[PDB]
């Protein structure tokens, strides 16, 4: 890997089980991507974002945007948006 992309996942509701949601999101990251860590970031009125530090490669064929679409299909996800992209 030589690229980290931070993907911000918002839950559908403040009462979403975030442990359950994290586990589900982890299973839909495609095999050629990796995962450095997941952080939780409280936003507002009880909504907590999950921030996935997705590992990838700075090449054609890799897209953190496609990882975010896999995430948007998972139950209890409102949105997934790529924040930061940066080489390591």
């Amino acid at each position: 890997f030589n690229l980290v992309g931070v993907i911000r996942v918002m839950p559908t509701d403040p009462d979403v089980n975030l442990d359950e949601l994290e586990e589900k999101l982890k299973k839909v990251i495609p095999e050629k991507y990796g995962l450095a860590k997941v952080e939780r970031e409280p936003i507002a009125f009880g909504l907590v974002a999950l921030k996935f530090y997705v590992l990838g490669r700075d090449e054609e064929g890799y897209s953190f945007d496609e990882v975010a679409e896999k995430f948007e299909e998972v139950e209890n996800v409102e949105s997934a948006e790529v924040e930061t992209v940066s080489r390591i």
Partner: protein
């Protein structure tokens, strides 16, 4: 004390990553655990050690042992760095994705000099609204520390940045692999008397948050929260939002032919109430009298006196683009997807007014029959669904866009002007 956000740019083999590596290593900002573990190996020579240590730093990052940023303190600032992806597909993520960089470091190798890429890196720096550049002419060892090569590459790097409206910026001859002029002053280039790179970082001007500009908050998500009501979530880009302010949402209000607006009751950032929100704060806020169904992602909040500018289907806007990639050629009628702030909308290329020279900024051909990969151009676009955009000289934060099509990033652009029709 002041925080500055820096983005390193340049051709991905010209040493910019190594430059960031050298900054951390020579300021002593390597984890003690790594440095102690290397000592077990005994003598390996300086070069082996720096390479091994930077490789160990990458592994710690990848294991989640700062992952996405490099951070260090200087005498007068906290510096956060981003090492920008060079592949053109990620440009949409740069334009649309997170924080304002205060400064860019463009690293250009003495050897190869300016590359076809470089004009793209420059234009991208401007498009992101980055106020200050620092230039680094790197790998000076591979050209024997020669002044007359440094000056050529400096001069031609200067034209690209000058054309974009950069000037009076540092241009520093460095070697990232050996250290010359990154943090340690060189002995190999007495002909150079400017700052070292870490000196240039320390002297980036403290950032002025755009609080003077009209309030703009692009909306990311929209919730109905039991017991509180309608809560937009977005980052304030410009201006300031205070509790009790009235805000209006566009293009919601234009689309529905009525004010989709109301009073701000509370504001939260990181689950803490705020009385006011400033540029860069990612907030949820409770707006009274607005239905959750009447606002969505891509709408933008504004004060009622200075509401967000809507470009309707009946209107068009002028833009300046760089064509990053297209498998054939762009022609009038081309209809890709425009991504700006939190909005995305189909757009129509209505005219191609000019092909521009990124070395001088001057019209090289009026009304070209098409443009293709690597052209810089002035086009006229028509949104196929309404969108909020601002002229870049008024509100740069809402004047930058990316063009997407057939899966890939086609163009990056800046909004010059808006014509009501």
């Amino acid at each position: 004390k002041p925080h500055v956000n820096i983005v390193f740019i340049g051709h991905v083999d010209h040493g910019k990553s190594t430059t960031i590596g050298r900054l951390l290593y020579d300021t002593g900002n390597i984890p003690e655990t790594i440095i102690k573990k290397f000592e077990e190996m005994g003598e390996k020579g300086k070069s082996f050690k720096f390479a091994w240590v930077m490789d160990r730093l990458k592994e710690e990052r990848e294991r989640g042992i700062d992952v996405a940023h490099t951070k260090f303190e200087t005498p007068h600032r906290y510096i956060t760095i981003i090492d920008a992806p060079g592949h053109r597909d990620f440009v949409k993520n740069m334009i649309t994705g997170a924080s304002q960089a205060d400064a860019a470091v463009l690293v250009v190798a003495a050897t190869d000099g300016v590359m076809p890429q470089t004009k793209e890196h420059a234009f991208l720096a401007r498009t992101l609204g980055i106020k200050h550049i620092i230039v680094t002419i790197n790998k000076m060892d591979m050209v024997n520390y020669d002044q007359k090569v440094f000056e050529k590459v400096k001069a031609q790097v200067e034209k690209l940045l000058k054309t974009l409206g950069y000037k009076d910026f540092p241009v520093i001859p460095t070697s990232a692999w050996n250290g010359d002029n990154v943090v340690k002053k060189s002995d190999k280039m007495p002909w150079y008397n400017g700052p070292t790179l870490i000196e240039a970082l320390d002297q980036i001007p403290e950032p002025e948050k755009p609080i003077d500009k009209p309030l703009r908050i692009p909306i990311q998500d929209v919730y109905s929260i039991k017991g509180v009501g309608t809560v937009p979530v977005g980052r304030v880009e410009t201006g300031k939002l205070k509790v009790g302010d009235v805000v209006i949402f566009e293009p919601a209000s234009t689309i529905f032919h009525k004010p989709i607006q109301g009073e701000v009751k509370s504001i939260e950032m990181h689950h803490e109430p705020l009385q006011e929100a400033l540029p860069g704060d990612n907030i949820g806020f409770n707006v009274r009298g607005v239905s959750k169904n009447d606002i969505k992602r891509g709408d933008v909040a504004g004060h009622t006196d200075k509401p967000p500018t809507v470009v309707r289907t009946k209107d068009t806007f002028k833009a300046q683009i760089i064509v990053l990639n297209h498998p054939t050629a762009i022609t009038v009628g081309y209809s890709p997807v425009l991504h700006a702030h939190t909005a995305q909308i189909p757009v129509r290329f209505e005219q191609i007014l000019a092909k521009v020279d990124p070395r001088t900024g001057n019209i090289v051909e009026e009304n070209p029959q098409f443009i293709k990969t690597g052209d810089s151009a002035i086009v006229v676009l028509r949104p196929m669904k309404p969108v909020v955009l601002e002229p870049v000289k008024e509100i740069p934060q809402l004047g930058r866009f990316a063009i997407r099509d057939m899966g890939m990033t086609i163009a990056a652009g800046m909004v010059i002007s808006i014509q009501k029709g």
